[PDB]
């Protein structure tokens, strides 16, 4: 197959989380596959079609935790799949994947904004926000909040290992919005003062979890302790299709040196492991609203989303399958 | 007012957490009172103990939350203050000071073994023991459950800002101790496989609250959650007398390049503040047992400890006061 | 311009709850549209629109708290902006006023007596049944199961400061039931005895929260602590749209003089405030079930009831709005 | 008033319990009504119709609880009775009761076999899976689980007072799943080893709660104490459409014979009473997940399990009456 | 017996509270029995003891539920008991009362103050709080916080029947202190702005139980729901003594009318009963720290208090018996 | 060397269980020191110390579980070996195990009746009492209240394997108690309507926890969460000296025959494991109250029952080693 330089980029920059953040993860997945599409030399569809079939497994195959990956993927090649099946020529089966990419990445940008809109109504003012990690659709509410004239001050957590943190802080305080930065033991200690949580989300399960950054499950645990309200961000690409029938999402489990550098952990004693999960689970009863681009909902109301936007697929293959 | 360099570096290294952990801090402090005396070239006891009480308070006044460092201050000066107003001579006075010294320093030394001998009863073969920062009174309780043949590993928390994990990964690794090293985050990801919670005490008040590094509370309160034991192994100078009245125990708040290099954080703008509690106050209902040299307590009779050996000196000034 | 007196009257008497209750309340402002439309002297539709559209807005700004007063003028003004706009005539538009405000009285007459029907079945001979405030859903289900020829018992609770425990209780007794009639300060002290705990709503929120009378949420609470089922007898009106995209509902602060009489209050030193909340959020865990007139459901499927009946309205403007 | 002595020997074998189990007991009643159909010598329509009502009756009026039951009989005279009031033939009324029972029947087999696959999916490596009672539908989880590789153990409580965890007991050590084997009251005492809980329904509730084997409730309980998940293995036809309007579920209370022998009990005082309740009611809040063969949902979600399946018949009467 | 008119004046003022508050009640009761022995035209010894053991008695008889009141008596009688046992002449007697009754009393007013000291040192500046009832030890410790120059602000709960929160709101005001007042229903809404819960108590009891105002258990119920801490002021006479030997506090059930007025019960129908418990009952899981003039205790440790201080006279019958 | 055969007698009985009850157990290990030293042979004083030495390893190694054994060999021989340690001849000696054998045994009689009475004072009439396993403490409780007229119900749940119930079911039975007997997993199902929970002990730790029957802990449960008061009824000499300095309790493993009979067990394949737990640990959250002979605690002051009465003891070996 003839895959293209901006396939094999954008998966390395997955991987070694240059490109980050579940939401921008899966346009930048959509938008390599419409780069494929632009530019295939190829002159069957058939060939067109093995083409992008491939360039989405490479995909895939970056990062497994966040199912707004799969489900860009899925958006993409569900339709080229379907368009190429009725022997869709080749300039037609083209545009549908370029097209297709386009929708999703413009829906993606609109969901956000949208949910931006809904939850900064759940934000009132003098309120302390306490967040985790570095989620769009958290500081969408955050942002759109402050721009209502609300005066919050948001609580970062840094977020070990890899400091998400600091671009949480950094971009929140540019636009005006008061900053307290802590280490993440700290949050129990700080959610006396502090009035709501707002965190993303990666994957959402049938039975109202939340997979997100490691530590949220903790966040929450000492949220709910407090009576502090747990609000989770997350578009509705966000929740996972295969937990409908069963799964178990997958734990990314990253390299020790992000933890312990290289220059380090080398002189420590065999008999130590370094274990980093990059994410934790979030059972639904430590949270209050899942707000998604549709409108707030409880989190056992995750199923309905699934079922009313993803159901039917699941008795179909992956359509980058054969 | 003649105060040897002794005392002066002493509270520099306490200060900089050169010398650190509550318990080595009391003892450094019993130490410079001792050489203060060893070395002091006083003619009457009341030039004596103006040196010792001037010593005493540059001592005091280093870190705040550590009870243990005003309780061996005290150990000393109370002791000292009996002999000066008895008559004491020059050189009674200078050996009341030096013994008492010593003694508290045995004392801490036996109490940290016996505490180790008292809570590894409490540790079963195959047991997967989660920690948190660096306690000499909690390793003590490892160490001696492996020497006796249990086949223990340890989940150690990295302990930001400071990293106190690294020095008791270290630590346990040495002794032939297999460890787990995660970020702090990752807490409650691990709990379901942890089987014991044992964890230090810089403070224990009149309730049985446990004042410890940041992030104890949380530990404990998802060991809680999980139906995990928590045992706190700490000794009886770890006690705060001055709760019994209702004092509050002031919890240190430490300098904002400890979680941020100077470098950086002078990089960013004025609207992100950066802070840094040293410890947080975890309530007695997440504690199971305190582990004690005196015995195995339910956190609740804290306060018979505290009556017992501390009560009778709240009637009295501080020794070191004017 | 031309509004008649029952609507003036109508408002009036919401305000000063002399009409009160969430569902009469409904009922009450449907009657004064239909009397205004049956009254009009508008001879052109757009005249009588107009009437509508500001005898809604007089009678919208009256009470906030029970969403199923704009649930009543919403479902006589959409159904009248939809004629007016499809260019009914004049007489066409009055009916479909009065018309559609009949259908909801009879709506909301008929679906009382159904949740009674529903939510006695889950009353047994012998129960104990506390309640709070004066609900007509709650007394429905009560009365119904009593008739059915089950030895029920209510605790009332008197509900300061308006003292509607009075009217509940005086009801009750009146249909041959027997009352405990308590203050709420003791519902704790008597939830030992208490079998089921049985309230009314004024709104119901997308996530499950029932907003009810001051005090329901500490009645919930500690039902909760015990074990009691708290059930909630609720119509489909008493649900809140506005909340699926995230509107807090605003809780009623009404006179300070109904709490301190205004003789005594004048003798009062500046520094007391006097705070008259009407209502609080009982968050959905502390519900069991809520009785509605198409079933039982758990709280959580609030978003279900809302979705499949007042979803479709969000992406317009208010029925009465220009 | 002509019943076929398969139905009577089905009913009796009912009722001592030789046919148990929620699936099993509602394939039996449809069989019986399978073979009333095929054995019948009615020579009218009529007749038939009321041969079938009235085995109906007869083999409703055996064992409440499990609703398994009544919506296998529901499935069967909902078609027959469609059938006879469109003026269907005598051997078009026959075949239509015969291919009826013959439906449910696969579809349980095949439900069964679904959930299997389903719930396994959620059976890790290594796990401890506590169950109780003997559970056709918890039984496929954990064989199709260990057919997967995944080496499990299973707990099996004897669940007194008929013993069902003999027969759990022999029929997973018959597929090579090793099994500990415990006394119901040690429960709690192994909740810390047991990863997975796993166990049937007779009954699920409009607002989620699960009717099961006597005992359940203080299963589920001590594993949401200590984050156990607790999964339950029920087909759609568990669930219980009267509960949507408000019924509750009579518990089964058998004979006492079934506690204390007969022998042994009439020598006790008449001043002891023997109480054996078959089933008992585990609340929403303890249960994570119900696996049906259309996929997880959280408790809550079994009100949207009714909605679609059999909220159409609640405003009819029963299909077997006059 | 020549009982004065002061014994019977202060008897009906206990009984119809104009004298109330369970340190005020006690303190009366020890001056009743003073002015007795003042007054007393006795000759004989034997004479003076009759009288004041019937005195005693009539005081005894007042209210039960408030400890304050026979610990008081217990206290002046044990002793006036020991001195007439050896043969103490008349005014040695006369004077054991008075000077015992003279302690009581001063001890007492000390005792408050010295609570006010101990529990203001847990106050912060900004701090609300949350009080019920009037409590003079409570109030002690929030004036004295006031006084120190932290700005404080309490919410006062009116307290229903008798408007006890008219008192404190008033009372507090005039110290300068800024009062919110609320009604008892409000007390859950209010928890979210609450730092700490301030209140009295009546009996406390070896388990750790703090009977005081009803109430006072949901208060505390909900300031454990969002972590506030409680904290009961009390002086160890608040301590119960036949606790520890298994005796159930008596809950005074106080007259309808307190309710409901006459001029409107006398209206209500037969079938309506109002309960008017004056007491509830705090367990003590869901109190923080106990405040008693020798320092905070945990609740647990009540047991200590009244083993160290009333162990001793419980093999003894009541020092005005015979 | 030299052992009567009624040591031997008594420990194969207490080895069945045909002697049983951790107070029944220590009377009849006494009991048994009380015969050796009575029948024996030995003409040097050393002779007995031997033969009781032995005789106290023999009655030790029988029942690890319950601690009231040791502490009543430990009764007997710390005064046997002051008395051989201070030059006691022959009948000195033999005379001090006697009387050390007749004090305990007094002292148990005793003990068990005063709790009866203590803890009687805390049933109230009407109550409903469930109670677990047969401990002659529980029943000391529940007769006394009904020998003081209270009309009390008991609910006898059945212990398994054993069937102590049944014991328990009878006996309450024949002094005129009405029984509810039920199967251990029915616990919660009637816990809604039983009123107190009174049960025994085999030992109670340092910090509250209790060891009793297998199950205690579920009922326990249960109980704290339908808010249930749970009473342990204890002598003092089943508090446990060694957890004091950190042991753990043995729990002891009975024979899998005693679940399933030797017949049935050997047909079982070899893939069952049978295990057979005799005792749990409830928690001391779970208690509300320890009644012992010297009144109510409590479940943290456990360890002020140790540190007064068995401290002492500690730093010396055991009363019966070489
Ligand atoms: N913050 C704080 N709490 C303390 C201190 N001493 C004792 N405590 C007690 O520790 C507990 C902490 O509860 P939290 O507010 O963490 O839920 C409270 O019961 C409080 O009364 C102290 O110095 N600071
Ligand atoms: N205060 C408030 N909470 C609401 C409203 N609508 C829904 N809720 C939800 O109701 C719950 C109340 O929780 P609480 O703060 O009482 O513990 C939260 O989960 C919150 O998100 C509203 O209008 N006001
Ligand atoms: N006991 C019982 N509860 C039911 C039934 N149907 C639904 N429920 C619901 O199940 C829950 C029972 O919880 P529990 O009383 O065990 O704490 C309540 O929310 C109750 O409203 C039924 O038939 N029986
Ligand atoms: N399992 C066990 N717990 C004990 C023992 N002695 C004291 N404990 C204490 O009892 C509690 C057991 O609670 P659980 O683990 O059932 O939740 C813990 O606080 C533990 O520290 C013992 O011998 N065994
Ligand atoms: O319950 C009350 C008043 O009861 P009443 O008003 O019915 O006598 C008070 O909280 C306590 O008695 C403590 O008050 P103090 O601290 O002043 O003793
Ligand atoms: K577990
Ligand atoms: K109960």
Redesign the interface.
């Known amino acids: 197959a003839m895959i293209v330089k901006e396939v094999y980029e954008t998966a390395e920059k997955i991987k070694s989380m240059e490109i980050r953040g579940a939401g921008r993860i899966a346009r930048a997945a959509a938008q390599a596959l419409m780069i494929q599409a632009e530019k295939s030399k190829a002159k069957e569809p058939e060939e067109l079609w093995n083409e992008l079939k491939v360039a989405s497994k490479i995909l895939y195959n970056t990062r497994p935790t966040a199912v707004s990956l799969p489900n860009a993927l899925r958006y993409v090649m569900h339709r080229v799949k379907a368009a190429y099946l009725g022997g869709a020529d080749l300039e037609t089966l083209r545009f549908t994947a370029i097209n297709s990419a386009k929708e999703f990445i413009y829906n993606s940008e609109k969901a956000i904004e949208r949910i931006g ?6 934000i ?1 003012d003098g309120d302390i926000i306490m967040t985790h990690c570095h989620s769009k659709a958290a500081i969408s509410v955050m942002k759109k909040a402050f721009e209502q004239g609300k005066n919050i001050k948001v609580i970062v957590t ?4 890899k400091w998400q943190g600091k671009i949480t ?2 971009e929140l ?2 636009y ?15 959610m ?1 003062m502090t009035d709501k949580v707002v965190m993303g989300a990666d994957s959402i399960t ?3 979890a939340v997979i997100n ?3 949220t ?2 966040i929450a ?2 949220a709910k ?3 502090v309200w747990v609000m989770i961000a997350a578009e509705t690409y966000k929740f996972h299709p295969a ?6 999402v997958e734990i990314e489990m990253r390299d020790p040196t992000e ?2 550098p290289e220059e380090e952990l080398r002189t ?2 065999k ?7 990059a994410f ?2 979030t ?3 430590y949270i ?2 899942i ?1 998604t681009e549709r ?4 989190p ?2 995750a ?2 989303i699934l079922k009313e936007e993803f159901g039917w697929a699941l008795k179909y293959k992956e359509p980058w399958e054969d």
Request: glycine letters at 8%.
């Open positions: 809109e809904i939850g900064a109504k759940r009132e840094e977020t070990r290992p802080a950094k305080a540019s005006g919005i008061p900053v307290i930065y802590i280490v993440d033991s700290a949050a129990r200690h700080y006396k049938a039975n109202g950054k490691i530590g499950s903790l645990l000492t302790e407090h009576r937990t409908m029938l069963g799964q178990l933890v312990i420590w004693p008999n130590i492991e370094v274990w980093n999960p934790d689970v059972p639904p009863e209050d609203v707000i409108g707030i909902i409880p056992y109301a199923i309905d």
